[PDB]
Amino acid sequence: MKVELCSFSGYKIYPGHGRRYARTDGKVFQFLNAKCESAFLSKRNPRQINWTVLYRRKHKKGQTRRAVKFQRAITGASLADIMAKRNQKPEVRKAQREQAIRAAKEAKKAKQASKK
């Protein structure tokens, strides 16, 4: 029950099995048996070898995002107040815009008076 290794060929290597090869470039590989080891030393790609894990995965052998609409508060405001404001009665809304219309009217009255 040491660390469970894996060969290049993808199989699990249990302790006491196989052999481990260290290269001059500081890279270390593990081989399950001399069949795997000779295949690596002859530099055969494991993706053209049928019985290897990589080939099975490559050839597909053996084989949603979230949208949210959170509505929160805004700093400097109130949580209940903002929902109440965004859900205000259309009669209040039309009363607000008409009193804005006359507000622009009386500002036109003030602008004409100031221009005089």
Partner: protein
Amino acid sequence: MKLNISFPATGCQKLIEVDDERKLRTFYEKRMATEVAADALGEEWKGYVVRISGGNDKQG
């Protein structure tokens, strides 16, 4: 193991330190951007489904 948890609707994201790989196997050997349930993190965490957003190595 520290584990930052973030709730989008409420914020105040916190850090939960856990010292049990047995209950951490729910996230082990998973991938990020996949949705898994943290119910094994205690019954207080029952019914809770999370998604992996990021993470840092032992070297940072």
